[PDB]
Amino acid sequence: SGFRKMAFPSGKVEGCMVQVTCGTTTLNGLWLDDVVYCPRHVICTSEDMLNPNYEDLLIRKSNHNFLVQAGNVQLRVIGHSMQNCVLKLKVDTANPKTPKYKFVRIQPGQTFSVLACYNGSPSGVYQCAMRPNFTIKGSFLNGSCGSVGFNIDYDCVSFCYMHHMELPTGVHAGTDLEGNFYGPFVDRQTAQAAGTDTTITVNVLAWLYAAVINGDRWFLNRFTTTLNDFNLVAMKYNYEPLTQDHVDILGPLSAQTGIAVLDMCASLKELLQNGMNGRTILGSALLEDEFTPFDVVRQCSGVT
Amino acid sequence: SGFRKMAFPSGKVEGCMVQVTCGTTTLNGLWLDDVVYCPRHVICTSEDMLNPNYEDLLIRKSNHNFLVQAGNVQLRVIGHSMQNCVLKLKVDTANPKTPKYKFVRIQPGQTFSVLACYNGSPSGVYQCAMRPNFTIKGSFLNGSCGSVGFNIDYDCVSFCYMHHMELPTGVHAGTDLEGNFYGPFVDRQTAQAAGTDTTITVNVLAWLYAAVINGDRWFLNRFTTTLNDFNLVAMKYNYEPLTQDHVDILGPLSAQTGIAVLDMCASLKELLQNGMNGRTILGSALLEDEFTPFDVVRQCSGVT
């Protein structure tokens, strides 16, 4: 019993973190096989960040200008290339701690663990969601760039995020491991406003199922609804529309609890309309949306 | 910017987790040097848990009855002893991944990371606090016993908790690594009710400092208070009394923000009396008390 914002164990990723320095910029790199992946803005001064031409800045850089340190041992850089917004530094040594891995590009609403790093050294691990506006609400200071987001399926690390940018609003933007930004963001210090941070409806419903499983049941009401009726209310409250695909994904939690998805929708509808009235659900005074249906099943079933 | 419930990177602890089986009971062990530490209730059937005599049950157990598996390799048990509520299984092999470590007994209000494990395999990491009633609000299923709580100071893991028990209220109880329960709890399936779960006042104040640092300032008011006046209000709201020792501990955050501790107390007093009025602080609708002043400084300064 109990339900926590739980991150993946970070060890497999800790084994991959390195320091990358180019001139006076130091950030983090991900070392997988004989390639170190890092944000291309490693090559920028803060002056350059205002209007960088990455291809032109990169011409002035040689392999030996990229200083890669793993622990307190230097890696030899034998090649470098730019792929979208990441650099790939080819080193002469395969990371002996390379886990089984994949690069995945996640969808908004999907959750992942972040290993916050500074100078190639892990400081902390926390759980995030790709927001519907393609920001993430992280905890990142100067030097945190190249920190990565990931999921683990048994022994396979799926890397889904690399940290590049903080927006003036103090929310975060970054890339998949192919260097493609999530959403419309760019690695330039310019006006970049985020769109509406809508609530991830399917995740709230999952978390209400988590609450029922863990004994928090006060919000279960006598009502049901339809997807169309629920969605009129979702729209009004800046919740994402619920699809039949979301209903299908919640099936296992519906089955485990015996509460029909549309009945839980009607409970959520009343919570939106009435509020919590000073009550809590799983120790929260607001409706939590950074647990996926898969997260709730995993945590409630104890997958390793 | 941003402020997250952040756990220590778990890798150093993942390297220590093993499976312990005695008869039909399987739980987790901590392997440090040539000793495996596990809950003594590994020797109990669920029938035994109703009224166990551990010394008498232990007489019927030999070294070879304790099956210790690290990955998919068996460790040879060459000795066993009971220390308070833990067993110490001496094995013939020092854990080659033993980090620098200490055993510490933490005080209520202190926070730590939990590596939730099943069958010696890590499932997740999350942040906890030793509650003022000496419970913790964890996420633990059958098989999670022997999962450990820890802090890390650079490269030294301080182990402070081992998971033993879920109370009928679905809150958690366990020991330090000397096998001494936190609070009055026992490793027996009996009536054990928790006392008042008071709010860790110094931790709330730390988290309000975190909020100011991270741009959330709407709750800063024009008032101050005294420790005695604040404490009259704390008492009424089931907050722990604030001491001058707590004020001293908040000094660095006071200094960084220029907000006197007693001014932040007066802001907290108004929040208690007025509520949040549907507003949030660092994405929470309630006052968070599982960040210590040290946690806020660490996360806000990026210690590795």
Task: Describe what you observe in this structure.
The structure is a homodimer of 304-residue chains. With 304 residues, the first copy, chain A, is of the alpha+beta class. Chain A has three domains: 1-14 and 100-197, Thrombin, subunit H, CATH 2.40.10; 15-99, Thrombin, subunit H (Beta Barrel); 198-301, main proteinase (3clpro) structure, domain 3 (Orthogonal Bundle), CATH 1.10.1840.10. In chain A, 23% of the residues lie in helices and 27% in strands. Chain A is built from eight helices and 13 strands. In chain A, the strands form two sheets. In chain A, strands 5-4-1-2-3-7-6 form a seven-stranded antiparallel β-sheet, with no helix packed on it. In chain A, strands 8, 9, 10, 11, 12 and 13 form a six-stranded mixed β-sheet that branches. In chain A, strand 6 and strand 7 form a beta hairpin. In chain A, helix 3 runs parallel beside helix 6 (251-257), helix 3 (201-213) crosses helix 7 (261-274) and helix 4 runs parallel beside helix 7 (261-274). The first copy, chain A, is elongated and about 70 Å long. The two termini of chain A are 17 Å apart. Chains A, B: There is a cross-link at residues 5, 90 (Glycyl lysine isopeptide (Lys-Gly) (interchain with G-Cter in ubiquitin)). Chains A, B: Residues 1-304 form the Peptidase C30 domain.
